[PDB]
Enzyme design. Structure first.
Site, PDB file in Angstrom:
ATOM      1  N   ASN A  81       9.467   7.545   8.696  1.00  0.00           N
ATOM      2  CA  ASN A  81       8.397   8.525   8.622  1.00  0.00           C
ATOM      3  C   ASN A  81       8.517   9.629   9.650  1.00  0.00           C
ATOM      4  O   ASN A  81       8.105  10.754   9.373  1.00  0.00           O
ATOM      5  CB  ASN A  81       7.035   7.852   8.790  1.00  0.00           C
ATOM      6  CG  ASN A  81       6.641   7.054   7.585  1.00  0.00           C
ATOM      7  OD1 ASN A  81       6.668   7.552   6.464  1.00  0.00           O
ATOM      8  ND2 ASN A  81       6.271   5.803   7.801  1.00  0.00           N
ATOM      9  N   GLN A 130       0.811  -1.207   0.000  1.00  0.00           N
ATOM     10  CA  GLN A 130       0.000   0.000   0.000  1.00  0.00           C
ATOM     11  C   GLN A 130       0.845   1.256   0.000  1.00  0.00           C
ATOM     12  O   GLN A 130       0.400   2.293  -0.498  1.00  0.00           O
ATOM     13  CB  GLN A 130      -0.929   0.012   1.212  1.00  0.00           C
ATOM     14  CG  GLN A 130      -2.270   0.667   0.961  1.00  0.00           C
ATOM     15  CD  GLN A 130      -2.259   2.141   1.261  1.00  0.00           C
ATOM     16  OE1 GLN A 130      -1.268   2.677   1.743  1.00  0.00           O
ATOM     17  NE2 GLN A 130      -3.369   2.809   0.983  1.00  0.00           N
ATOM     18  N   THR A 140       2.072   2.855  13.428  1.00  0.00           N
ATOM     19  CA  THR A 140       0.721   2.666  12.927  1.00  0.00           C
ATOM     20  C   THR A 140       0.312   1.203  12.911  1.00  0.00           C
ATOM     21  O   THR A 140      -0.678   0.853  12.267  1.00  0.00           O
ATOM     22  CB  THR A 140       0.587   3.256  11.526  1.00  0.00           C
ATOM     23  OG1 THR A 140       1.134   2.341  10.572  1.00  0.00           O
ATOM     24  CG2 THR A 140       1.330   4.576  11.437  1.00  0.00           C
ATOM     25  N   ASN A 143       5.401  11.304   0.237  1.00  0.00           N
ATOM     26  CA  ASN A 143       5.645  10.611  -1.015  1.00  0.00           C
ATOM     27  C   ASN A 143       6.178  11.557  -2.081  1.00  0.00           C
ATOM     28  O   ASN A 143       7.017  11.159  -2.892  1.00  0.00           O
ATOM     29  CB  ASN A 143       4.364   9.925  -1.477  1.00  0.00           C
ATOM     30  CG  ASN A 143       3.873   8.893  -0.485  1.00  0.00           C
ATOM     31  OD1 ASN A 143       4.535   8.609   0.505  1.00  0.00           O
ATOM     32  ND2 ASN A 143       2.712   8.323  -0.751  1.00  0.00           N
ATOM     33  N   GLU A 190      27.392   2.227  -9.696  1.00  0.00           N
ATOM     34  CA  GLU A 190      28.299   2.980  -8.845  1.00  0.00           C
ATOM     35  C   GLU A 190      27.914   2.896  -7.381  1.00  0.00           C
ATOM     36  O   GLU A 190      28.794   2.868  -6.522  1.00  0.00           O
ATOM     37  CB  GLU A 190      28.339   4.439  -9.277  1.00  0.00           C
ATOM     38  CG  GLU A 190      28.580   4.607 -10.744  1.00  0.00           C
ATOM     39  CD  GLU A 190      29.688   3.719 -11.223  1.00  0.00           C
ATOM     40  OE1 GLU A 190      30.864   4.026 -10.938  1.00  0.00           O
ATOM     41  OE2 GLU A 190      29.379   2.697 -11.864  1.00  0.00           O
ATOM     42  N   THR A 248       1.745  -7.133   2.898  1.00  0.00           N
ATOM     43  CA  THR A 248       1.989  -7.384   1.485  1.00  0.00           C
ATOM     44  C   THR A 248       3.428  -7.080   1.116  1.00  0.00           C
ATOM     45  O   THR A 248       4.178  -7.973   0.705  1.00  0.00           O
ATOM     46  CB  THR A 248       1.048  -6.541   0.638  1.00  0.00           C
ATOM     47  OG1 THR A 248      -0.255  -6.548   1.227  1.00  0.00           O
ATOM     48  CG2 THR A 248       0.980  -7.096  -0.767  1.00  0.00           C
TER      49      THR A 248
HETATM   50  N1  GTP Z   1       5.706   7.323   3.917  1.00  0.00           N
HETATM   51  C1  GTP Z   1       4.629   6.614   3.610  1.00  0.00           C
HETATM   52  N2  GTP Z   1       4.353   5.457   4.297  1.00  0.00           N
HETATM   53  C2  GTP Z   1       3.262   4.735   3.992  1.00  0.00           C
HETATM   54  C3  GTP Z   1       2.416   5.149   2.990  1.00  0.00           C
HETATM   55  N3  GTP Z   1       1.421   4.255   2.897  1.00  0.00           N
HETATM   56  C4  GTP Z   1       1.617   3.289   3.814  1.00  0.00           C
HETATM   57  N4  GTP Z   1       2.752   3.580   4.506  1.00  0.00           N
HETATM   58  C5  GTP Z   1       3.340   2.774   5.580  1.00  0.00           C
HETATM   59  O1  GTP Z   1       3.013   1.415   5.387  1.00  0.00           O
HETATM   60  C6  GTP Z   1       2.973   0.769   6.634  1.00  0.00           C
HETATM   61  C7  GTP Z   1       2.009  -0.410   6.620  1.00  0.00           C
HETATM   62  O2  GTP Z   1       2.075  -1.130   5.413  1.00  0.00           O
HETATM   63  P1  GTP Z   1       0.972  -0.797   4.308  1.00  0.00           P
HETATM   64  O3  GTP Z   1       1.637  -0.408   3.016  1.00  0.00           O
HETATM   65  O4  GTP Z   1       0.094   0.299   4.845  1.00  0.00           O
HETATM   66  O5  GTP Z   1       0.102  -2.125   4.101  1.00  0.00           O
HETATM   67  P2  GTP Z   1       0.771  -3.346   3.324  1.00  0.00           P
HETATM   68  O6  GTP Z   1       2.254  -3.129   3.242  1.00  0.00           O
HETATM   69  O7  GTP Z   1       0.137  -3.483   1.968  1.00  0.00           O
HETATM   70  O8  GTP Z   1       0.422  -4.635   4.201  1.00  0.00           O
HETATM   71  P3  GTP Z   1      -1.115  -5.040   4.373  1.00  0.00           P
HETATM   72  O9  GTP Z   1      -1.881  -3.900   4.993  1.00  0.00           O
HETATM   73  O10 GTP Z   1      -1.201  -6.259   5.251  1.00  0.00           O
HETATM   74  O11 GTP Z   1      -1.675  -5.349   3.013  1.00  0.00           O
HETATM   75  C8  GTP Z   1       2.533   1.829   7.621  1.00  0.00           C
HETATM   76  O12 GTP Z   1       3.358   1.788   8.755  1.00  0.00           O
HETATM   77  C9  GTP Z   1       2.753   3.147   6.924  1.00  0.00           C
HETATM   78  O13 GTP Z   1       3.672   3.907   7.662  1.00  0.00           O
HETATM   79  C10 GTP Z   1       2.687   6.311   2.296  1.00  0.00           C
HETATM   80  O14 GTP Z   1       1.940   6.688   1.401  1.00  0.00           O
HETATM   81  N5  GTP Z   1       3.799   7.045   2.606  1.00  0.00           N
HETATM   82 MG    MG Z   2      -1.586  -3.372   2.894  1.00  0.00          MG
END
Ligand code: GTP
Ligand code: MG
Ligand code: GDP
Ligand code: GDP
EC number: 3.6.5.-
Lengths: 431, 119, 302, 50, 426, 426
Positions: free
Chosen positions: A200, A10, A173, A222, A248, A139
């Site tokens: 973050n 995500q 989170t 982002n 490099e 994921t």
């Molecule tokens: N900097 C930043 N961190 C993000 C963003 N979106 C999600 N995260 C981070 O992603 C972490 C959790 O993983 P996610 O990407 O939300 O979910 P996932 O990796 O797909 O895993 P699942 O929820 O089980 O499917 C959180 O701690 C957020 O800090 C983003 O747009 N920018």
């Molecule tokens: Mg996810």
């Protein structure tokens, strides 16, 4: 020369949602897939050209929940991305490394791989892969590591630049992100070649201090991450005075086969009015790239010693002043370097100044610096994470989930002791 | 209420003229001054001072019309003689080689295909 | 340490030195400007000569195009009159060949766009029975060569087309002579006007009509084919971008743009049926129309 | 080898582009000198009408 | 007649070569299209040394440009005097080594060196009497240093009797670009001590403070440094191209400068170099040229020559001058600073005079000194090399391609033995 | 005077012949309308070798096109140069053979050979003093190879004293169109060794190789390969058509290249072949032609001659040339690489010079080498024939037609001992 990008989870695909906006802006491609109106190859490394005036990006979005992916499919860039490249499973991994690594991975990764193979086939001069993921989730951690394993067993020698979003010490989170981060690192170690961390908390503090925006969402994070990525691929994209390619970083920044974890920093992070205020020169930004108030990972390099540094410069910069500035840096004593490496800098220069996205918060700068450094503050970070991992593991909390997905205590134990060995290694080389 | 991603990524800021304004390609030219202008010695209103005479052709051939002295052609510090040092010796006695090779380049350029060697 | 920089006007740091360096730089540009040898003004005069207000002429009142007038050549499908720059001719030792392309952006009658029809007279060696026409008007199936108005220098003359004329030519596809961006016969403006390659023919497009319309006066607006008479291959628009100085034109070459629909030539030849005696029709990109001149003015003889 | 040919075309495109950019860059300096002298005579006029 | 085959390696070599062929083309009056448009015939008689008559005044250079990334080739064919290089002479790989000497000497060379050897062969038998080879490259990079030294070794085992000049930039600690500068520099110099005939050491630190102090520039970008090296390379080769009062070819310079087979690392200077605010201050006379020539701030290496002794030296003068003033000036600068010269060789200075100064100047001079202060530069590199190797740092990128550890030990022994013998003769 | 009758068989033969007649008609300046329009009177004197005056200067070629599918003939008459062939010469069957040698040699030859023999015998006896016949055909297809070999059989049965060339393309395994390539190739080769005077082996693999490496072409369609093969065919017959300093016709070349009556499979190369971007950067000297001529990657066959020995070799030059440089260059390439040449014949290189260059060029060359590296190709084909015949694949379309199995054994045995005698003479 071409490079392809894969976005997992995500976080990875929202990061890519910013990144590809920036790329289309920098190469002048409309959001519907074509330039307005020749013979320029500058775009070729990121966008392939098809048919009549149509440029489709060389990236693969993949996630297990269809929500964010078809949100992209309904977003502004519908005609831009290939219908096949966006790949969407039917249900998430749900903060569960085993679930994302054994249950759904076994059926999604094969499609992802026989798809990336056709991408590489259509490509010609592939530099390598670059992956965007977050290890705190399910994921990007589980299927991330799975696809990394299979990419390494398929190609191997091609570099895999990995931008990974680690969890923050106090800002959290999730709850099982220690488990997931550990289990992801256990494979990131011996499958990634150049792994760049992005926290973050540090970026929140950057947006609070420099850009003085008080209530930031993930969009701004982002956006500046995309700024950094574009600033480090500008050398492949455009012709500068001293360009540095993908290999490099593998050569000048990885002294030992299991020490590849880089702190990153960017300068100058300046808003509109402060652009008018400040006189942008090279010494002050080369200095600004070294304070902990401008690093993308919340840790103190004052407690550590550097191993290597790489400095991408963009814009109206000549080698004279960057040479003078790094000389001042080397003769300063507030920061320090490992005694055994006596020359720990690598410059690279590209002529084009960074672009600005309409509606963004950054201003048009004349020149910018992206610093990718190596240290032992990361060895401090891994211990800080190890502590809170073992605290939970001592009572076997949350373990029944993983063992119900199918794993056992063996992986937990071996990853714990691997992180311990890695701790020992960092404390040994910071000699 | 709308979704956060759509509240941020829109089409107003793009694709009209801002793409043209952001595809500057400032990386292309980055002009340097020149190579010669750093090393040239002399006034800059005049063409560069090319010396195309050697002491043999100057003295033994007496290329200069007035045969004053051997050391007059050498460069001294003093303007008393520096005014009268000759720079270039123009004449067919020099240009004979270019005359020959230009005749050759002309006969190379202008050729008849159907001319057997025997005839 | 590091201190702020300043503009050349303020005196600080090595202000004398940067100011002097700039003085010399600018002096160079000025001297060259006095001489007239800058890249800038080098081709401004060439632009003045190559793009000038030009009026097309006709030698007589009648609508049919006549030998020796100033005409245009334009592709019916997409406009884009054909014109070859005298400059940027290919550089070799024995080659005076100069490339010719099709300009979409420039279609106004200009010196370089204009073609001037020259009658072709066969030599004595040539073994070609030719229909004899007395009048000065040009018909179908008649040998004709095309030179272009002097855009380089000089003044036009009735048939000489300047002191040295350059006429439309095309040589078969060898290793040396091939179109730059595609693999067809190149088409240029060579200075060897007396060679047979420069001769062209104007034929009506429909295959059936041409035999009946063998010798008839050709009108201005009618769409016709220009076939190289030494290779019997029509003139075509290559549809490939061409980067010469005046604009991004289109390549022009000589190919037989045939639709790949087979004709049973052999069976029909054995049968002797009428339909057998016909070349396959050409495609829409072969069509060209002459643009004649409204006013009447004969050009001065050599 | 095919990619080498594909680059051989873009090289010619780049040559023409660079020529054009240089011929514009010279007129840029010309106009800079023109504007400097024009501002000079502008201030000269503004002074004497007061 | 006597022929120089020019070879350019790596990014530094390609850009320096570009400025080099610009200056040479200027001196022979050939226009950027490729045709002769000079005035006199002093230029026509000696163009075979650097060019070849194609046909119809088309004189194309006798150069071989090689690299591994198309970025340099685009920058070469972009600028003016980029249309005169023969398209067949653009031997050019596609992967790119990137600061890995092993990739530059074992992997990429293994499929590229044969093709560039074919071109170098065809180019060498196209001319009759070689004077030798002249190659400009770097020592810190991968595709210049490793690929170049491999080609140097290959051509030195095929043509053992021809001369060889190597214009190689060397890394400095204050101006240090990459991280593995030592790991590449030491192995390259280890190849050069057994294959090259003599090396002209360049560096960016000396070029920068020259452009600060003497030339007094604001932003001395790479275009100006490359032109200074270009002026040096043209100055060293002027003797073949133009008639003069006392000619001195390359081998004549090598035997006057090389006392021992391993003592062939020079430091180079160029005169006159003055600021454009002070051009009219100076006269054009031999004493003024000489005082600027023997100064320590005009050497193009980061070695204070007063920290050691000169073994031999050479001065190539261009311009109509008096030989007495030349010889008396050499005698004075050798007798006054007699401690800076070795004692067991009398007359440590070779001189030469040609009659054609470069275009735009009235009179020039080029200094080439075989000093023993060069061991300070090699100690400066070898001490960093002993630091990294002891910890076996950065080493796996090298060992994982065909290199082993004892190769690094040989490089240590050779460098330590070379600086030992320079320290000996001090 | 001395006359050449042309015969084309098959699709490959029809398209090669179409481009061939385009080039020759260009060389003599005759347009596809049928009329002479050239300038120099050197071209009138030797057109009777190829054309016949009909009415008002209508010169029609002395060629016979034969095949079994109208598809190629429609492509012939479709475009330009389709109106010059006489309609009577379009002898034309209607059923089709389709990659079946048996069909092309027993069942379809039975009813086509009466008509072609009528046409060829009429077109041969029409001119007075034949020099010989010329055949261009393929060894993969059926109506080209089958009808070709049957026609060769009947012709050599009737006119034994006249010469006979055969330009045959042999199928390569890297560029392999059809599946019954070996079954056709070996049966055709077994026929050629007994009836053809001499054969010149072409191959599409080496032709594609040339258009990639040397010509540097973007999209090499068959038009380009046909142009190259045509350049060969014009070069081999140049000396008949234009006066020279040392004439050499087909019979003169055959006697100086065929030492033994079964060793008549030459290999061919052409010179010069350079990209148009590399045409200005070259000169035109006899060494410049010889370097590319004797180069290994310039042969138009898939056999590196460096794996074998040149039995004999021939060079045909065109242009105003210096015979001395011609002879000494042949001598130097003979004396330097003295391992690639046989021992029991000194002076292996027949040479000839004509004074008229091919149109658009200044000076050209044509190579015809009879080597013992051709047995690489025959082995490369014979091993596939053995691989198929061991298990009788595709056999029934042949056996159930009149052909038997012993024809296959003799074809393989004659293939085998031919390679053995080539290997013996190396
Ligand atoms: N900097 C930043 N961190 C993000 C963003 N979106 C999600 N995260 C981070 O992603 C972490 C959790 O993983 P996610 O990407 O939300 O979910 P996932 O990796 O797909 O895993 P699942 O929820 O089980 O499917 C959180 O701690 C957020 O800090 C983003 O747009 N920018
Ligand atoms: Mg996810
Ligand atoms: N003097 C000079 N040095 C240059 C130039 N370009 C690059 N360099 C030097 O080349 C060194 C790095 O060489 P590198 O590019 O890695 O060589 P390569 O990668 O093997 O081709 C750096 O120390 C630069 O200072 C130039 O134009 N002039
Ligand atoms: N060089 C060349 N080869 C050709 C051409 N046409 C066909 N071929 C080759 O001929 C072989 C097959 O010939 P084919 O068409 O079957 O001959 P046919 O059936 O007897 O007329 C294939 O390997 C093709 O590559 C051509 O125009 N030029």
């Amino acid at each position: 020369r071409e490079v392809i990008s894969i976005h997992i989870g995500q976080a990875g695909i929202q990061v890519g949602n910013a990144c590809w906006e920036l790329y289309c802006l920098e190469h002048g491609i409309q959001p519907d897939g074509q330039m307005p109106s020749g013979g320029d190859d500058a775009f070729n490394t990121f966008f392939s050209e098809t048919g009549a005036g149509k440029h489709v990006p060389r990236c693969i979005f993949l996630d297990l929940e269809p929500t964010v992916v078809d949100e992209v499919r309904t977003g502004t860039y519908r005609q831009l991305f290939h219908p096949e490249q966006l790949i969407s499973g039917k249900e998430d991994a749900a903060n569960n490394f085993a679930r994302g690594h054994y249950t759904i991975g076994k059926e999604i990764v094969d499609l992802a791989l026989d798809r990336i193979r056709k991408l590489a086939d259509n490509c010609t001069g592939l530099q390598g892969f670059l992956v965007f993921n977050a290890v705190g989730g399910g994921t990007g951690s589980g299927l991330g590591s799975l696809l990394l394993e299979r990419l390494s067993v398929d190609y191997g020698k091609k570099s895999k630049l990995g931008f990974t979003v680690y969890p923050s010490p106090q800002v959290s989170t999730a709850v099982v992100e220690p488990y997931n981060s550990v289990l992801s690192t256990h494979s990131l170690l011996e499958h990634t070649d150049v792994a760049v961390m992005l926290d973050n908390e540090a970026i929140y503090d950057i947006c609070r201090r420099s850009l003085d925006i008080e209530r930031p969402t993930y969009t701004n994070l982002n956006r500046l991450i995309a700024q950094v990525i574009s600033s480090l691929t500008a050398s492949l994209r455009f012709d500068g005075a001293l360009n540095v390619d993908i290999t490099e970083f593998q050569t000048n920044l990885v002294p030992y086969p299991r020490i590849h974890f880089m702190l990153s920093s960017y300068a100058p992070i300046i808003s509109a009015e402060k652009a008018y205020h400040e006189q942008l020169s090279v010494a002050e930004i080369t200095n600004a790239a070294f304070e902990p108030a401008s690093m993308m990972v919340k840790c103190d390099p004052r407690h550590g010693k550097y191993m290597a540094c790489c400095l991408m410069y963009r814009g109206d910069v000549v080698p004279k002043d960057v040479n003078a500035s790094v000389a001042t840096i080397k003769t300063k004593r507030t920061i320090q370097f490992v005694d055994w490496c006596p020359t720990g800098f690598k410059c690279g220069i590209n002529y084009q100044p960074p672009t600005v996205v309409p509606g963004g918060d950054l201003a048009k700068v004349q020149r910018a610096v992206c610093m990718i450094s190596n240290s032992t503050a990361i060895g401090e970070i891994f211990s800080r994470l190890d502590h809170k991992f073992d605290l939970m593991y001592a009572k076997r909390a949350f373990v029944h989930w993983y063992v119900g997905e199918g794993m056992e205590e063996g992986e937990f134990s071996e990853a714990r002791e691997d992180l311990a060995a890695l701790e020992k290694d960092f404390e040994e080389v910071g000699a | 209420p709308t979704t956060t991603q759509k509240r941020s990524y829109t089409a107003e800021g793009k694709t009209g003229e801002y793409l043209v304004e952001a595809s500057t390609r400032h990386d292309l030219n980055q002009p340097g001054v020149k190579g010669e202008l750093l090393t040239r010695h002399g006034r800059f209103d005049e063409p560069p001072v090319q010396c195309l005479g050697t002491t043999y052709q100057l003295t033994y051939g007496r290329a200069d019309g007035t045969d004053r002295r051997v050391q007059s052609y050498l460069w001294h510090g003093r303007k008393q003689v520096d005014y009268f040092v000759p720079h270039s010796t123009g004449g067919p006695s020099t240009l004979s080689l270019t005359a020959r090779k230009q005749q050759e380049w002309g006969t190379q350029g202008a050729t008849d295909a159907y001319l057997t060697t025997k005839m | 340490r590091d201190t702020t920089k300043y503009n050349a006007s303020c005196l600080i740091g090595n202000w004398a030195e940067d100011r002097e360096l700039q003085r010399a730089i600018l002096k160079d540009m000025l001297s060259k400007k006095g001489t007239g040898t800058l890249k800038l003004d080098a081709f401004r005069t060439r632009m003045a000569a190559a793009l000038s207000d030009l009026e097309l002429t006709k030698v007589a009142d009648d609508p049919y195009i006549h030998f020796g007038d100033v005409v245009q050549l334009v592709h019916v499908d997409t406009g884009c009159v054909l014109a070859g720059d005298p400059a940027d001719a290919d550089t070799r030792t024995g080659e005076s060949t100069c490339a010719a392309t099709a300009a979409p952006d420039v279609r106004a009658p200009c010196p370089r766009n204009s073609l001037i029809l020259l009658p072709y007279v066969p030599p004595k060696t040539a073994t070609a029975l030719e229909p004899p026409y007395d009048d000065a008007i040009v018909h179908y199936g008649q040998k004709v060569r095309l030179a272009l108005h002097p855009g380089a220098a000089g003044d036009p003359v009735d048939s000489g087309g300047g002191p040295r004329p350059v006429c439309l030519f095309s040589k078969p596809v060898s290793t040396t002579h091939a179109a730059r961006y595609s693999r067809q016969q190149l088409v240029g403006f060579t200075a060897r006007t007396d060679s047979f390659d420069c001769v062209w023919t104007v034929v009506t497009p429909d295959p059936a009509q041409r035999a009946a319309a063998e010798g008839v006066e050709v009108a201005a607006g009618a769409p016709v084919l220009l076939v190289h008479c030494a290779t019997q291959k029509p003139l075509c628009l290559e549809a490939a971008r061409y980067p010469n100085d005046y604009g991004v034109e289109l390549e022009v070459s000589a190919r037989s743009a045939l639709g790949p629909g087979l004709k049973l030539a052999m069976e029909q030849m054995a049968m002797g049926v009428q339909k057998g005696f016909l070349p396959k029709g050409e495609q829409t990109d072969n069509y060209w129309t002459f643009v004649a001149g409204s006013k009447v003015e004969a050009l001065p003889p050599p | 080898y095919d990619t080498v040919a594909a680059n051989a075309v873009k090289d010619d495109f780049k040559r023409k582009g660079r020529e054009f950019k240089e011929r514009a860059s010279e007129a840029q300096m010309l106009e800079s000198l023109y504007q400097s002298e024009r501002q000079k005579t502008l201030n000269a006029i503004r002074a004497e009408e007061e | 007649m006597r022929e120089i085959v020019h070879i350019q390696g790596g990014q530094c070599g390609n850009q320096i070569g570009a400025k080099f062929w610009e200056v040479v083309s200027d001196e022979h009056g050939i226009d950027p299209t490729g045709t002769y448009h000079g005035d006199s015939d002093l230029q026509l008689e000696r163009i075979n040394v650097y060019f070849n008559e194609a046909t119809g005044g088309r004189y194309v250079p006798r150069a071989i440009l090689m690299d591994l990334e198309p970025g340099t080739m685009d920058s070469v064919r972009s600028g003016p005097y980029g249309q005169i290089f023969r398209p067949d002479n653009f031997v050019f790989g596609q992967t790119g080594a990137g600061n890995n000497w092993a990739k530059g000497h074992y992997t990429e060379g293994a499929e590229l060196i044969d093709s560039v050897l074919d071109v170098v062969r065809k180019e060498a038998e196209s001319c009759d009497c070689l004077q030798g080879f002249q190659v400009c490259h770097s020592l810190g990079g991968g595709t210049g240093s490793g690929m170049g030294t491999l080609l140097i070794s290959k051509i030195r085992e095929e043509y053992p009797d021809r001369m060889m000049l190597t214009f190689s930039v060397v890394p400095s600690p204050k101006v240090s670009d990459t991280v593995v500068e030592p790991y590449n520099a030491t192995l390259s110099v280890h190849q050069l001590v057994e294959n090259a005939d003599e090396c002209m050491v360049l560096d960016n630190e000396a070029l920068y403070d020259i452009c600060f102090r003497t030339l007094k520039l604001t932003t001395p970008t790479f275009g100006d440094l490359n032109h200074l090296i270009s002026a040096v390379m043209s100055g060293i080769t002027c003797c073949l191209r133009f008639p003069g009062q006392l000619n001195a070819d390359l081998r004549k310079l090598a035997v006057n400068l090389i006392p021992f087979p391993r003592l062939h690392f020079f430091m180079v200077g160029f005169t006159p170099l003055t600021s454009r605010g002070s051009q009219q201050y100076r006269a054009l006379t031999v004493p003024e040229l000489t005082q600027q020539m023997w100064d320590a701030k005009n050497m193009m290496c980061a070695a204070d020559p007063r920290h050691g002794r000169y073994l031999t030296a050479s001065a190539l003068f261009r311009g109509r001058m008096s030989t007495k003033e030349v010889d008396e000036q050499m005698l004075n600068v050798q007798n006054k600073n007699s401690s800076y010269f070795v004692e067991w060789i009398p007359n440590n200075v070779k001189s030469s005079v040609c009659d054609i100064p470069p275009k735009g100047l009235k009179m020039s001079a080029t200094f080439i000194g075989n000093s023993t202060a060069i061991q300070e530069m090699f100690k400066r590199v070898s001490e960093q090399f002993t630091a990294m190797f002891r910890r076996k740092a950065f080493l796996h990128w090298y060992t994982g391609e065909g290199m082993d550890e004892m190769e690094f030990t040989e490089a240590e022994s050779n460098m330590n033995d070379l600086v030992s013998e320079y320290q000996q003769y001090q």
